[PDB]
Design a protein around this ligand. Sequence first.
Ligand SMILES: O=C(O)CCNc1cc(N2CCCN(C(=O)CO)CC2)nc(-c2ccccn2)n1
Ligand SMILES: [Mn+2]
Length: 294
Amino acid sequence: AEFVPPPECPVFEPSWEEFTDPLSFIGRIRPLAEKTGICKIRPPKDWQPPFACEVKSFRFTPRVQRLNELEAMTVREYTLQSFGEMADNFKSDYFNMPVHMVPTELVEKEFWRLVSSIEEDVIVEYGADISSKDFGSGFPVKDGRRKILPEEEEYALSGWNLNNMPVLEQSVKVPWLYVGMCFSSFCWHIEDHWSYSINYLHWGEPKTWYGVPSHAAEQLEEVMRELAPELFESQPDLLHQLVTIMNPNVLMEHGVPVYRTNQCAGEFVVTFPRAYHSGFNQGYNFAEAVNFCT
Ligand SMILES: O=C(O)CCNc1cc(N2CCCN(C(=O)CO)CC2)nc(-c2ccccn2)n1
Ligand SMILES: [Mn+2]
């Protein structure tokens, strides 16, 4: 009856030698991680980049998300502080306990119950698709728009700085920010041009991920087309991906391999080419993501 968590995706804790270059490291872990779609990377313990966003002027209007909008078939400005105050108040009121005491398995189980619930309409807000050009990237950048301390220059030049990832494909982009709260989510989808993606959680409560390897991409799309609303069945992928929310247990019951992970603060998540992925936030957090080429 209740949610059965998918198996855990691979977690890598590279040494300082293996942490020298991201593309080299991702290429060596590819034989395993591409069989799970997503993977988690924990940097060395002393690798702690400072949060470099202009928090004094950071303002945004988040988007409203109704969890059961598909089942039921049916805009305030915040600062970073005011959104976090709303986010913590929502979670502590909903679970009747401090936000840091709510188990991740409980938020996960309750999230998927609310998505399919008809008698309970839960509505959250998500600060999504905030460009790193608006208020700066979460990573220090030698832009000249903000001071970089000597202890922060190694992070401004690091290859794991998402602003330093290669983004140009060989033929004949900047990171985006996401301010999450409890139950704010993103549905199943693949990146444009089947591109890689790397995600870094700067701070806050964990972000729960679900991933499907690329070898099962067609199987997921077939299951989606079979069970998604018939009114959205003939929609193109770029538009259907806006409303492709589906319980992972439903995919697993149809033979789709699904892996999960809890991305905690200071940890990376890499999605491989054509790896369908979805997830939700356990609470107030801040993430940065960019597509990169190999
Ligand atoms: O929350 C994170 O830390 C990043 C999760 N990853 C996203 C998030 C995203 N936002 C936020 C969630 C709502 N939402 C969807 O649910 C449909 O995707 C769309 C807007 N949009 C994308 C995306 C879109 C088009 C092509 C590639 N990617 N990826
Ligand atoms: Mn995406």
